[PDB]
Amino acid sequence: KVFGRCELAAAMKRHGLDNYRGYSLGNWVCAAKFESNFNTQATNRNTDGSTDYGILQINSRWWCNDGRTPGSRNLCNIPCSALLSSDITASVNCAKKIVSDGNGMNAWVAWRNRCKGTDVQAWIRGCRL
């Protein structure tokens, strides 16, 4: 699905993301613009061979089942392609837990560089929720 700016994210709050586990709603919409370009079908195989999946860019190495990942933990218990699907109602669950790890946003590389120190609520500005 190709999502628009203001219509790609209203569902996050529909899935519990408002100031969840201390992260502001100012910090969520920035990152996906930096991991799959508002796109759900973008998954990218790192040099590490653990292919990343979804807008979220989740790698096959620590979280989901693809089978081309040796030694994969698969803590998420979900087929990796179940993430990319037109319906995103379940992928956020693993996301909503990835941070509880105590690394929170550390797992994502874009928020730490492109979204850190930014005008984050300026990504939620101008929209109706």
> Of 7, 48, 52, 66, which is the active-site residue?
52
Phi-psi category of residue 95: left, alpha or beta, with phi > 0 → left and psi -120 to 50 → alpha: alpha
Provide the domain limits for residue 82: 1-129
- Report how many domains make up the chain: 1
Tokens of 93: 């669950």
Question: How would you write the chain as a 3-class SS string?
Answer: CECCCCCCCCCCHHHCCCCHHHCCCCCCCCHHHHCCCCECCCCCECCCCCEEECCCCEECCCCCECCCCCCCCCCCCCECHHHHCCCCCCHHHHHHHHCCCCCHHHHCHHHHHCCCCCCHHHHCCCCCC
Amino acid 117 reads G
Q: Is 87 a catalytic residue?
A: no
CATH of the domain at 99: 1.10.530.10
Amino acid 28 reads W
Q: Is 52 a catalytic residue?
A: yes
Residue 87 is labelled as binding a ligand: no
Pairwise CA distance, residues 75 & 32, whole Å:
22
> Of 18, 35, 87, 119, which is the active-site residue?
35
Select from 110, 83, 112, 87 the least CA-distant residue to 95: 83
Select from 78, 101, 100 the least CA-distant residue to 91: 78
User: With b meaning 16 or more CB within 10 Å and e meaning fewer, what string describes 84-108?
Assistant: beeebeebbebbeebbeeeeebebb
